[PDB]
Design a protein around this ligand. Structure first.
Ligand SMILES: NC(=O)c1ccc[n+]([C@@H]2O[C@H](COP(=O)([O-])OP(=O)(O)OC[C@H]3O[C@@H](n4cnc5c(N)ncnc54)[C@H](O)[C@@H]3O)[C@@H](O)[C@H]2O)c1
Ligand SMILES: NC(=O)c1ccc[n+]([C@@H]2O[C@H](COP(=O)([O-])OP(=O)(O)OC[C@H]3O[C@@H](n4cnc5c(N)ncnc54)[C@H](O)[C@@H]3O)[C@@H](O)[C@H]2O)c1
Lengths: 484, 483, 483, 483
């Protein structure tokens, strides 16, 4: 059916090799995707380098921002096509795509264009020996060619989260979306083309990681930065790969996030929240909770309530009425998730609900669905409690003491995010500041303001993006010092 | 004389020692105890544990007051630090008294002040339910900072990392260059006498590969590695910490240009390039080794620079009117001399210098070389492209502004550049086109600690100074409250 | 033609009306209903109440999108706005098409953007009990903002206040100059059609004393009065709001100098001073009426400027190659000609102009004057010290840099200054010593809306622009939480 | 004892003198020389001239070091300062030792530290010709700062203005309250002994109307007047400086509320309200004179408060256990007792106090009153709306969140408010809706010098603290370079 081409130096192109994009709802082929080779990656980088010297480089910040708003306008004008593309690749509920995925991707471009317009830099006066003094000022320049490599859990959102500020700062871009979700990125290339974005400014390359476009990108001496979102292991590999070039790097990596429910929490709200944080996108979001700690006094009641709500979840088609969960991204990913399902049992988990695959008796049985799953009875040292599963699952465990549960949350090689449920003023602020992660929510989950810094600690990442931090990462900060 | 490690509040020796040698006369001045992997581990663990002790409980005001006390402690032993810096490096006494030591003290005072005055952000947001949410950020200690430092400005560059690390509430494991260990050891004593809790600041001595340096970079207990040194070494360190995804901050090598336009104050530009080429015997990362001079003033510039270079006094650190001391070591001299020969093989004219001076005294056992000027090499000569880190510069002419800008930028490095012009438009128009972290106009080596500092390309990764230090040496955490 | 008030979502007439006269030919453009104290009260109360309505419930994003919609509305009716500004003021159509209207549009877009991107501060502190405290700040709407604006750049200066007021979520009662009420009235129409809720924006027409202007300033229901106008008017308004301790922001008169150094690009400086003296027929607060030129180039500069001034086309707004229109009114020309007489009486040499051109057509019933240059007055002449606000400049020589800085600063005003020099150091050294809010080097009237703008001494109080507008049009509140 | 003015580096007497009375016992402490118009003028002129002397040539680092030396000078005479404040005010010795003096020392140190770390902005901009322009801002000394301060927290509020004025490179003419002139005179000695150049800091004694206070505000030589005092005095000053269009900063009166929600920690709330009502005998602008308590806990709260209030030890500054001293003066006691009476006449139930304690010693000649609590008055009672400035509070029950918010806000004042609740949502939701400059949650009088501070409505104009101080006490100037 559909064909997904690379976009290089203003032109769509095919490749020697192609791979399949497969609908996880039913296992049916959606499209053929051309895998760019080493030579085409080179062509992309060189074009990106030259574009920096072209008309793109002559644009005022205001004109550049106007054009980026045009890109956002073009996505909005093809809104439903973008919805259809995200849904096809990933099986995500249509409502989620219409309210989260696509509008956030548009908001990424608008927000960074606006920040580009309002941003400024610094002026430092200094005294000198002769009493004439000196002036030091800083400027933001384009960093150069930014290599962007993105994952499949929020395809257009996380892709544009890198591409928008890269372009807002006047860089050119070579971007490699996940092989699992190539569609919406390809449509973005079309939007770029139609908006009149100069050739070479934005380049789209398809493929995999090792011995494919992804690796080739990280190895190319022509890039100035590599921004990456994906597994921690992949982060380290890429960090080694750019080391000889001393390329700027920004990494958003894996997590094993906890949710903590204190005794004074609003229990019904906490249950709804943990339900959402565990099972949204079938638990395939980096921000999902897979470890949950609940105060002993309310533990059993909490687990009972969550069981009931988890069992009311509708698992099925993306446009099915009242659907809460679609399938996992792919059969390979499902294999990995079920392997963890077994392991949890072997490690001695009580299976509160789920633990298998739903029986549909239609085409969905050919897809890659699993059941939302809850475990109890596992130790803090259990693999299923420590390793990132990336499916619709959580383990729940009681605790007694505040300092205790803080230490248990922090006892991890990851540190992406955490959610805390409490109605107590002091406790919200005291506990939150003690959690060793980049992002804590109190009495909510997945709230994101694009102005805030975002990033992880430990294995969950390196550096920060968002607001001023993106404006700093995607720019050369240069100092000019004038003796007066 | 012996230089010990400082681990968890105690000066400790080690299994093996190495020679610290005076580059003025080749004489041995101390033995330095090389830390082994287990001592490195001990240091990191101690640093990890200090985070949970009294250090971790200090308010920002109390921590800052304590850091000022460290500065005071250095100040009260000022001449001993001067003696220590001079001993290891052979730098002129006057330069140590006026640049090296006071600036090391200022590192501590300034970052302590920045710590006291820093604050974070508040973001309000709307929610579908109409009650909204509050996001705020906080700065927390990153954890244990591994500091690895070079020998060109030993204490200055060392404290440039250590001060903000401590100011942000971290604990530190710091490994100074094997070539210049004394001032860092003195710092450990100052720390001790000031009552810095055990494990907060740890000093380990040794080399890079297969030594204390490598082991520090491999330890999963650190949260960040901040580094100043050669580009290749930076790469090596980048790979070593990759599996841990440690935060990294790199200030690497350069091949910096100076540019003199026809409308420059000629005498000032000659004086400026003399300083930028030969300060510290050209052993500063910010030194110029490439100079482009407009053809209308080329011959006069070169002639004037020759005269001033030959007036430079090369000698003892306490010799009257001394301008230059020796190179850091014989091994470094052999490297610099190898370039002195390569320049000749490459076809260079030697305007002045090109060898080693004859002293007919103990200095001949030291590691002195002559300040050297070359002309006649092409832009692709290795001597014009690779960093030598000696008291040397090649001078070539240029004709056009866009031409010289291209030749300046035609480099895998991009640390710093100096331009000389009296024209308003040109200064601002040219400066912004040079692909480096720092451009000076009509001066050199002016540094304000508030400003961002770093290189592009092979010259580094990230930025430090001012709030960039406060951000790098801190965990930035976002806390989002639903209302 | 009739210009109605706009109060609580309705266009309303009034008991009295006054004449809007076209200064080109003296003909009647429109009747303008003057708001009485009763209508002003009704406007202020509507504004207060609007703060409790749908307007007050908008997210920052929605409020910004609505203000972009206001900008789109103006843009949709671009030429009507052009025609309105031209009719009231006689300004050249080209100036209105390229400066006045697009900048007024840019005011709304820029402050909407600033509103979306602004945030506030988070301060952590330690306490005796070791639990600490959180301190965060928020920006709330100040309340009802009274806006009183002048006639020199009617829509531009009007929207310069109204845009940030609305971006910060305030409601507005605005009173434009009686000389130029037309574009403000169109703006009210755009507001209405854009769907801005009743009471958010209110337009009241009238004069100052014993009229709408005074009644706005006396109303206890406002939270702030932002004002651009004559310095003496500012003083009056400050007294008028003193018992209510209203927030105030004043942009007042000036006697701005231009300085031309010996190393200036002379032709560019001549062109520059021509524009700074005669743009809008010298009726801009930012205009130069004092000009200082280095002695060595004084005669050549004066001769050059004379030639250029005499080439200026003084005529109809859409006449080919027109450079200057008339003054705003006959009353204003009576004042300007009185100064023309005074300058002769004070001993001035009239290099050119000094009178009223003769058209022998309908323009003779208008309010034109000639571009005028004086020489020969002392620094104490009233014509050299008082703001004339016509197309005039006096030119005086100088010999020394510090001398001229002192003469520039020797004024009760301090709005702006323009300096001409090609020398890098001079540009920065001199500029920082000028006691004004804004210095231009080698240009004039460049405005970036992110910058702080305002004057010193009699030229004003407070700053607006960028973050300064976001702070002034907001309540900055501090919330301190004990943890 | 005698208190002299400090003008142009000299302590000088005056033609007239007035009495400083100890309010503990009515005894005369010192005679205070009242500055006349000629003396005030001599002060301003010396300050003006001081800007062009060595003070103006100081680098920011050197200036800050000298400010820290002032702070050192106060620490060195810590007990003399404590005695001075106690003598003037009768404040408990413990409170002056822990609060008053250390915080005035912190004012100098903190604003010195802010000044060293401060910086400004760079704006890059595109132009028609494609070469662009550079806009940057600088902070300059505003000029001569007139400071007029109250007797509330004499040294603390005095230094809160003087410290940032000086940190910003200004010079100062300062008029402390006639009721509390001692600590300020001691500060002038510290300035003198620290070698602060003559004319930089000038101290003039006297009153407001027809005295030095008025004379300062009428003087055309000053650039700003910063003021802390009664709201009616603020309006008077705003009128006085209106013709010079001087920069103003006003911190005025309040009638602050405390609010205790049903979910508050009741014991902590009682302790909190006790402190907020009676600290310094309720003579702090930040004191709570109205208290709203949820109905369900109203009786229990009023009872606990009565008990704790009755345990308050009223007497000697150095008496052990002492909690309260006297009011500042007999004149003020007459005013306070007058409200005590009016409260009864208005229908108040007197829960405790309501008169003056009997001592049977010299304290009966002093100016004491009892801590008083009222119930049973309406929101419209004069005693519940008008600022009394004594050790008094009125407690009223409430039922609804939106109700009490409206009742707190129904005031012509809006300085500060304290809220007590343990609920997360409620704390943030309610706080943001209170129309004041400062809301405390579960505490009172926590001040971080980095935060913006100020009131809304009659409680003030402008903001001070952190960068707001750095902005108010500086000329922000914009320099625009065409490239
Ligand atoms: N960009 C800057 O701001 C800046 C400042 C000063 C110096 N420099 C550069 O640094 C170099 C200066 O001299 P240098 O010889 O001391 O640099 P270097 O890289 O050889 O050594 C620096 C430090 O790293 C250690 N080290 C060496 N190999 C290591 C390894 N494999 N693992 C861990 N640690 C290792 C050394 O022991 C030493 O402490 C020059 O290139 C100079 O330009 C840059
Ligand atoms: N907003 C704040 O942060 C803050 C802080 C402390 C006190 N206050 C307020 O200050 C008041 C108490 O102090 P106060 O009794 O000294 O107030 P006050 O207004 O009577 O006197 C204050 C100062 O102003 C001077 N002054 C009086 N009339 C003057 C005039 N016509 N011209 C020039 N100067 C004049 C006085 O001499 C004195 O030095 C209370 O209202 C209190 O709330 C406010």
């Amino acid at each position: 059916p559909s064909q997904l081409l690379n976009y290089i130096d203003g032109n769509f192109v095919t490749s020697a090799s192609s791979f399949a994009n497969i609908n996880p709802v039913n296992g049916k082929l959606i499209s053929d995707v051309f895998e760019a080779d080493a030579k085409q990656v080179n062509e992309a980088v060189v074009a990106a380098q030259n574009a920096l010297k072209g008309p793109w480089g002559k644009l005022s910040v205001q004109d550049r921002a106007a054009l980026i708003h045009k890109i956002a306008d073009g996505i909005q004008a093809r809104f439903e096509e973008f919805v259809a593309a995200e849904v096809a690749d990933t099986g995500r509920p249509v409502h989620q795509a219409r309210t989260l995925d696509i509008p956030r991707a548009i908001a990424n471009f608008r927000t960074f264009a606006d920040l580009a317009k309002t941003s400024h830099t610094d002026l430092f006066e200094m005294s000198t020996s002769d009493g004439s003094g000196a002036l030091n000022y800083t400027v933001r320049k384009p960093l150069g060619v930014i290599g962007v490599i993105s994952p499949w859990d929020l395809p257009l959102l996380l892709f544009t989260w890198k591409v928008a500020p890269a372009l807002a700062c006047g860089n050119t871009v070579v971007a490699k979306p996940s092989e699992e979700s190539p569609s919406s990125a390809t449509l973005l290339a079309e939007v770029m083309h139609d908006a009149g974005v100069p050739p070479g400014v934005f380049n789209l390359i398809h493929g995999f990681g090792k011995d494919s476009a992804g690796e080739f990108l990280t190895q190319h001496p022509g890039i100035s930065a590599l921004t990456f979102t994906g597994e921690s292991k992949t982060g380290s590999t890429i960090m080694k790969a750019v080391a000889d070039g001393v390329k700027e790097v920004s990494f958003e990596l894996g997590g094993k996030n906890a949710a903590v429910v204190f005794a004074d929490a609003d229990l019904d709200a906490a249950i709804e929240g943990v339900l959402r944080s565990s099972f949204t996108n079938s638990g395939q979001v980096c921000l999902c909770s897979e470890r949950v700690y609940v105060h002993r006094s309310i533990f059993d009641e909490f687990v009972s309530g969550l069981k009931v709500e988890a069992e009311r979840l509708v698992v099925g088609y993306p446009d099915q009425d009242g659907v809460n969960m679609g399938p996992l991204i792919s059969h390979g990913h499902r294999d990995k998730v079920l392997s963890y399902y077994r392991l949890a049992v072997d490690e001695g988990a009580t299976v509160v609900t789920g633990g298998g695959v739903p029986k549909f008796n239609d085409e969905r049985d050919q897809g890659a669905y699993v059941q939302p799953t809850i475990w109890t009875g596992l130790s803090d040292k259990a693999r299923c409690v420590t390793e990132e599963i990336f499916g619709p699952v959580c383990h729940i465990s009681p605790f007694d003491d505040e300092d205790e549960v803080i230490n248990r949350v922090n006892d991890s090689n990851y540190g992406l995010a955490c959610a805390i449920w409490t109605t107590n003023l002091s406790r919200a602020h005291r506990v939150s500041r003690q959690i060793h992660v980049g992002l804590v929510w109190v009495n909510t989950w997945y709230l994101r303001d694009l102005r805030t810094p975002f990033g992880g600690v430990k294995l969950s990442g390196l550096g920060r993006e968002g607001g001023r931090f993106s404006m700093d990462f995607y720019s050369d900060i240069a100092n000019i010092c004038i003796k007066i």
